[PDB]
């Protein structure tokens, strides 16, 4: 076939990774394993960990934006009520 451009991924047998030596892996048939029910008592307290480290990165920016939103909204409500028609004429045009 036609010549193909060099990439950073090959295929089974020539993936393009470095030569591996010394690493030995082990596995056991899913058939021989305890049918799905053990994901509790042992896998419950361990869980919820990949969000205890992340919630701050999500929560703080969320908080900042929710507060900013609530504030501008409440201010708009005031501007269009009787009490604020004076301020409305001022900040408007």
């Amino acid at each position: 076939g036609p010549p193909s451009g060099k990439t950073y991924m090959g295929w089974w047998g020539h993936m393009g990774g470095p030569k591996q030596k010394g690493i030995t892996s082990y596995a056991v048939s899913p058939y021989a394993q305890k049918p799905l029910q053990g994901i509790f008592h042992n896998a419950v307290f361990n869980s919820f960990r990949r969000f205890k480290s992340q919630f701050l990165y999500v929560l703080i920016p969320a908080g900042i934006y929710w507060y900013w939103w609530k504030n501008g909204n409440e201010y708009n409500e005031f501007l269009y009520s009787k009490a604020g028609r004076e301020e409305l004429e001022r900040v408007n045009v």
């Binding site: 591996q20 690493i23 021989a32």
Partner: peptide, 10 residues
Amino acid sequence: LGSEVRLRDD
């Protein structure tokens, strides 16, 4: 026991 051991050595 159905299982495997992979002794990869490139």
